[PDB]
Amino acid sequence: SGFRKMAFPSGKVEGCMVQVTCGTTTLNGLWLDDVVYCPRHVICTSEDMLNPNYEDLLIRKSNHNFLVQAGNVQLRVIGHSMQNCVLKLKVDTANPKTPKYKFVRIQPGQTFSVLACYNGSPSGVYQCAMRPNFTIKGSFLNGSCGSVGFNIDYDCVSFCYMHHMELPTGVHAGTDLEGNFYGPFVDRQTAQAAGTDTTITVNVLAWLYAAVINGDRWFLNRFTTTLNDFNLVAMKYNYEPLTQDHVDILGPLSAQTGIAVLDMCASLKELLQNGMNGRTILGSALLEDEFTPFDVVRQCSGVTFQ
Amino acid sequence: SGFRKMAFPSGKVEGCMVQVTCGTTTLNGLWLDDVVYCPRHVICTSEDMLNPNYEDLLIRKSNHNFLVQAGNVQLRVIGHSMQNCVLKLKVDTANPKTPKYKFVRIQPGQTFSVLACYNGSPSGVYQCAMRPNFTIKGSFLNGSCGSVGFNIDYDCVSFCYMHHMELPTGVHAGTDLEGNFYGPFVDRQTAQAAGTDTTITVNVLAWLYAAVINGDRWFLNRFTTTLNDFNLVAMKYNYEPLTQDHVDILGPLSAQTGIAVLDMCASLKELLQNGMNGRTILGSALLEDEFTPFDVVRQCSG
Amino acid sequence: XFHXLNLGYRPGC
Amino acid sequence: XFHXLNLGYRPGC
């Protein structure tokens, strides 16, 4: 029992973290096989960031302008190319600790672990979600660029996020591992802001199932709402619409607890309208939306990794 | 910016996790150099747990009664001893992934990372605190015994917890890496319960400093308090006494924010008396007490 | 009770 | 702004 915000074990990723320096700019890189991945703004000065032509700026760099450090070893850069907003540095040595991996672009509402790094050295691990507005509520200081987000299935690391920037509200924006930003953000020094966000309804429902699984049932009510009636109330509280696809996804948790998805919707509706009334759910005084249905099942069933 | 419940990177610990089996009982072990550490109840059947004499039970075992598996490789047990509530199995192979490590017994209020494991395989990592009642609010299913708690400083792993058991309220109890339980708990099947818990005052103050560092001041006020007056109010809300040592420990955060410790105490006092009134602090509607002053400095600075 | 599958752990005690 | 020392990151934008 117990239910905690839980990250994937970070070991497989720790073995891939390096430091990348170009001129006066230093940040983190990800070393997989004979390639090191990092934010392309590593090649920029402050002047350049106002209106960078990255093609032009990169052409002005040689292999020897990049200093890549793994632990206490300098890796020899033998090639460089840009892919969208990430730089790829080909090195003469394949990382012997390379895990089985893939790169995946995730959807909003999906969660992942972040390994926060500074100077190529792992500092900490925490769990986050891609918000509906394509930011993440991370914890990152200057120097954290190139830290990555990931999931693990059995022995395979799916990298989904590379950190690039912070927005005025203190939330974070970045790319997939192929350098495409999540959301409309750009790697140029120009005014940028997070859009209005919404609550990830399917995840709140998942967390309510987690609560039931852990013996926390005070909020249950069996006045089964309809999807339409529910979404009317959701709209009002700035919750994402719940689709039939979300209902299907909640199937296993519904079956495990014997509580119909639309009954849990009825409970959530009541929670939104009346609040928690001084009570907590899984130790929280607010409705939590950064556990997916998958996360709940994994944590409640004891799934492990190789 | 941002503030998250944050764990240490778990790689150094992952490389130490093994599966230990005796008879019908399987749990996790920690493999450091040529020794594997695990809960001594690995040697028990359910009958034995009612009133175990572990000295008597262990003397009935041989080295070959213990099956240790690292990955898909069987380690040969060549010795065994009991130390308090942990079993130590000497194996013929030193773990090549052994990090620099020490064993430390922590105080209530201190935080650590937990690497939850099943069948010697890592499942997840999370951060928790040793509660004043010497339990932890973890997430553990049957099979998680032998999972460990730890801190990391530069390259050195300080192991502070091995998991043994769950209490009726769903909280968790265990030992240090030398097998001494935190709290009054015993590794016998008999009625046990968590005592009434208290809030870790020094940590709440630390987290309020975290909030200020990240740009939130709404809960501050113009008042100060004395340590004595503050503790009078704390007592009433089931908060731990704040000592001068705690005040000294909060020094760096005080200096960084320019808010005197006793001024933040005045803010906390007001928060306890009036509540938050539907406002949040760092995304929380409750006062959070599982970040130490060191955790705040580590995460907010560097 | 104990988080080791034959040793009689029961959620809630 | 960007979380890489001299590229002008300012808390709050």
Author numbering:
A (entry chain A): 1 to 306
B (entry chain B): 1 to 302
C (entry chain C), D (entry chain D): 1 to 13
Authors' description from the paper:
As a biomedicinally important test target protein, we chose Mpro, which plays an essential role in processing the polyproteins translated from the viral RNA37. Peptidomimetic inhibitors of Mpro have been shown to be therapeutically valuable for the treatment of coronavirus disease 2019 (COVID-19), with one approved for clinical use (nirmatrelvir, PF-07321332).
To gain structural insights into how GM4, including its γ1 residue, interacts with Mpro, we obtained an X-ray crystal structure of their complex to 1.7 Å resolution. The structure reveals GM4 bound with high occupancy and in the same manner at the active site regions of both monomers in the Mpro dimer. H3GM4 is accommodated in the S1 subsite, forming hydrogen bonds with Mpro C145, H164 and H163 (GM4 residues are identified by a subscript). The F2GM4 residue binds in the S2 subsite, making hydrophobic interactions with M49, M165 and H41. The y1GM4 side chain forms hydrogen bonds with T190 and Q192 in the S4 subsite. G8GM4, L7GM4, N6GM4 and L5GM4 form a loop leading to γ14, which is linked to H3GM4. γ14GM4 is positioned to make hydrophobic contact with T24 and T25; the side chains of L5GM4 and N6GM4 are positioned close to the surface of Mpro, with L7GM4 projecting towards H41, C44 and T45. Like the binding modes of substrates (predicted) and inhibitors (as observed by crystallography), the carbonyl of the amide linking H3GM4 and γ14GM4 is positioned in the oxyanion hole, making hydrogen bonds with the C145 NH (2.9 Å) and with the G143 NH (2.9 Å).
